[PDB]
């Protein structure tokens, strides 16, 4: 957009620019506002967006656990649970299976067979 | 895009609806007025009563439905209104709460003088400067007649009346007619905790400090 407003928030108060999140020369994080207003890096004025075996083996191997690391924090809701030895863990998905007792009517039926 | 001259009266109109709404819904719990607190991105309404648990309901079922009930008609976005419940203090010194005792005590068959005498003793026992109970209607006779019960002293004219005296009016509906109940409570000015500490027509003179004459010059140095 050509705006001269250098938003140096580094994504603190704005979402990051998904296409170009960070600078490759000085590591500054470019937010969404910092993205469209200028295609050049704010700090070092380096180009921000250019106009498996081939890649470096560590780089594609690097991002594997970043996806896991984001997965860890995304799926951290159940990671905070405590196992303990006094929890029911009721074997129930979300309900008592419609509150009806006929699936265990075979238990005494088996006892009848016994 | 609403005129401020209309926006502000709207709040008074808005405040007027809840007061009637709650006093017709939570009266049996001893409804003691409402407070409206607006905040950016969410507005909160505080409800005060004695039987807050009955106001709350089991797991706040009544509180949850009251919010939604206010939510649907008052046309707010979801999550913008939250209703709280808290115990009203100084239950003796509360005109709206105390007047409901008349409404309860009259409906069960209790006599008039004893019921009014019970309240005036109760309010005075709660550290009140004065009380006033007025009952009007058809009282055990065809002719209407109004009794008045008072204790202590009260003021009747001027701004301090609007500050130290709170008035409550309740209509009692019996099978013979409608009875009117009026309660006036004179709170202690010293325990006001806000504004005036005493009536404007009273003056306090500090006691002089007595010191004997020196009768001889003396000099004190460093």
């Amino acid at each position: 957009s050509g705006s001269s407003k250098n938003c140096n928030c580094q994504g603190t108060r704005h979402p990051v620019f998904d296409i170009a999140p960070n600078c490759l020369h000085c590591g500054k994080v470019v937010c969404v506002i910092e993205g469209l207003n200028k295609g050049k890096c704010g700090h070092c004025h380096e180009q921000l967006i250019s106009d498996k075996a081939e890649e470096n083996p560590e780089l594609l191997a690097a991002q594997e656990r970043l996806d896991r690391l984001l997965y860890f924090q995304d799926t951290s809701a159940e990671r905070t649970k405590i196992i303990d030895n006094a929890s029911d863990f009721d074997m129930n998905q979300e309900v008592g299976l419609w509150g009806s007792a006929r699936e265990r009517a075979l238990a005494l039926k088996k006892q009848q067979r016994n | 895009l609403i005129s401020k001259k209309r926006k502000l009266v709207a709040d008074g109109v808005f405040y007027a609806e809840l007061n009637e709404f709650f006093t017709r819904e939570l009266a049996e719990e001893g409804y003691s007025g409402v407070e409206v607190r607006v905040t950016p991105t969410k507005t909160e309404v505080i409800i005060r009563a004695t039987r807050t648990q009955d106001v709350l309901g089991e797991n706040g079922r009544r509180i949850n439905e009251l919010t939604l009930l206010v939510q649907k008609r008052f046309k707010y976005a979801p999550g913008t209104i939250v209703l709280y419940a808290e115990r009203v203090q100084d239950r003796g010194l509360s005109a709206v709460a105390q007047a409901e005792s008349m409404k309860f005590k009259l409906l069960n068959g209790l006599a008039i003088r004893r019921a009014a005498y019970g309240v005036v003793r109760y309010v005075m026992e709660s550290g009140a400067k004065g009380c006033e109970v007025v009952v009007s209607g058809k009282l055990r006779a065809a002719r209407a007649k109004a009794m008045k019960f008072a204790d202590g002293f009260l003021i009747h004219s001027g701004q301090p009346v609007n500050d130290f005296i709170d008035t409550a009016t309740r209509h009692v509906l019996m099978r013979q007619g409608v009875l009117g109940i009026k309660v006036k409570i004179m709170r202690d000015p010293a325990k006001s905790r806000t504004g005036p500490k005493a009536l404007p027509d009273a003056v306090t003179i500090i006691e002089p400090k007595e010191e004997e004459p020196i009768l001889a010059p003396s000099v004190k140095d460093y």
Partner: protein, 537 residues
């Protein structure tokens, strides 16, 4: 996570019907310090691997090409900017790599400086030098000189030193002479680890140092860069509000997200045995837990006290007899090497314990014996690393299982046993998990049921860092003021105005003893009373 409308406290009669007594409690005093700031992880996927640093000398070392995402919002913010930032990473998640950001921050702008590292314990001091003496000096030409209570090097070496590691107690003495110590003139950046220990014994010493640079930075009109390493800190706003850090640059993640996952188990134990009988009930579960949770992988146990170090080995070895391999997990197939290794063992418990694959460690042994119990673990000769809670600060033991052997530690001040604080066990949880060796880590928190419900609520969450300097306030008040800085009592109020206690006293009046008024004005005279109470003493 969803804020409740209120908090309801219910009381019911167990025998009578309808005897209900309940109260609803609201909360409106939600203030900005009363808020976990935290930071969510956002997509900055592409890192700056090694080559994006523009220094061949640095790129010639640190063969790490993987650039840590766990420093994403940090990255190069501290590399170029000259503003304070708070970076907290538990376990081995940047103790080495982040500690070198001081060289990258400003050392290239002005080289040949004496930027000082500060370590809260001498155990941290030894490792901060041994590893980095062959990593920084051979390439950067910068020598590392130790400044502790046991080492007193020549001042010329200290002045010409570049990497200086000093304990806060020893750093206080140098800072006690800050007016005339010509050595301390080149401080541009200070790097610290284990910040959250303000509540510890060295915390008042640690806290008073940080406040000293604040006046130095303010009076001299140039900033003194500060960097602190710690664990997840609940009161991050006061952490930001007192350290003078800016918005750009910050690092605080919860214990849920780590490079290695951690699994916590809670075990309550009865409230009848005072301290003596409550090891016999729980020692047997400890043995099976090692077999249950660490089949063929290293474990680690931490006894309560010195005597518990011995008794644990006595029973565990005894219980080890009733199973297949008496010398279980000895990992020494060569008998000739076994006798050579057992030759160096000196006496007592270590003599008859090392054969069982169980290691013992306590502060009653020869210095080389402690290394022997750890050198074998480096080769995974012995799995059990039974020790006392002092080792939770020292060498990074690559263990997987960490069992909290009991709770409550004896205090001579109260002539009794007082419970653990949530600053040691939180760090104790960091020992579990072996980097690049196993996927996840496990730990158990053997304790009483009475504190079980409490800990289950807060072990994952934790508590804010507090300050307890007003127990030894007389000693460390004269650290900066006895030089003749302030002569009037009016400025004494401003003296603590830049301290962490001033931040927390208004925020937490109840913790600091204030019970009359919760307003900021009410704290003022109480703070003045603390100022007053010192001078008559």
């Amino acid at each position: 996570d969803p804020l409740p409308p209120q908090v309801v406290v219910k009381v019911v009669s167990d025998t009578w019907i309808g005897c209900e007594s309940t109260h609803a409690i609201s909360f409106q005093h939600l203030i900005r310090p009363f808020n976990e700031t935290l930071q969510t992880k956002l997509l900055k996927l592409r890192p700056l691997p090694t080559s994006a640093l523009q220094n061949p000398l640095i790129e010639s070392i640190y063969p790490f090409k993987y650039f840590n995402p766990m420093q994403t919002m940090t990255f190069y913010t501290l590399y170029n900017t000259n503003e304070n930032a708070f970076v907290g990473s538990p376990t081995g998640s940047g103790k080495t790599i982040v500690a070198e950001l001081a060289i990258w921050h400003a050392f290239k702008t002005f080289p040949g400086k004496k930027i000082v590292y500060i370590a809260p314990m001498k155990a941290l001091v030894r490792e901060r030098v041994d590893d980095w003496r062959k990593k920084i000096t051979p390439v950067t030409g910068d020598k590392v000189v130790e400044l502790t209570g046991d080492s007193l090097p020549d001042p010329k070496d200290v002045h010409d030193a570049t990497i200086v590691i000093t304990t806060p107690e020893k750093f206080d003495g140098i800072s006690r002479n800050w007016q005339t110590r010509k050595f301390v003139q080149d401080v541009s950046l200070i790097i610290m680890d284990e910040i959250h220990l303000l509540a510890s014994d060295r915390g008042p010493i640690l806290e008073m140092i940080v406040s000293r640079m604040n006046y130095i930075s303010s009076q001299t009109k140039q900033p003194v860069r500060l960097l602190g390493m710690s664990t997840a800190v609940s009161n991050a706003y006061d952490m930001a509000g007192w350290l003078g850090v800016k918005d750009h640059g910050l690092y605080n993640f919860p214990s849920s997200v780590r490079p290695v996952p951690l699994k916590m188990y809670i075990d309550g134990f009865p409230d009848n045995l005072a301290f003596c009988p409550l090891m016999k009930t729980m020692n047997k579960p400890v043995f099976m837990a090692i077999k249950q949770h660490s089949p063929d992988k290293p474990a680690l146990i931490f006894v309560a006290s010195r005597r518990q170090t011995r008794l644990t080995a006595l029973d565990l070895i005894h219980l080890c007899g009733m199973e297949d391999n008496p010398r279980r997990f000895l990992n020494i197939d060569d008998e000739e090497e076994l006798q050579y290794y057992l030759s160096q063992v000196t006496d007592d418990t270590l003599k008859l314990s090392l054969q069982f694959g169980i290691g013992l460690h306590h502060a009653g042994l020869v210095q080389k014996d402690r290394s022997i119990s750890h050198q074998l673990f480096q080769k995974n000769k012995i799995q059990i690393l039974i020790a006392t809670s002092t080792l939770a600060w020292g060498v990074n033991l690559p263990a997987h299982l960490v069992i909290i052997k009991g709770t409550q530690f004896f205090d001579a001040k109260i002539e009794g046993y007082r419970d653990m604080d949530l600053t040691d066990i939180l760090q104790m949880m960091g020992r579990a998990g072996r980097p690049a060796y196993d996927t996840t880590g496990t730990a158990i928190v053997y304790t009483k049921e009475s504190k079980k419900m409490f800990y289950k609520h807060f072990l994952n969450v934790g508590f804010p860092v507090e300050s307890s300097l007003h127990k030894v306030l007389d000693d460390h008040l004269g650290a900066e003021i006895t030089s003749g800085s302030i002569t009037n009592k009016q400025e004494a109020l401003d003296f603590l105005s830049w301290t962490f206690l001033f931040r927390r006293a208004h925020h937490n009046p109840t913790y600091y003893g204030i019970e009359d008024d919760t307003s900021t004005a009410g704290v003022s005279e109480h703070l003045s009373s603390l100022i007053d109470s010192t001078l008559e003493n």
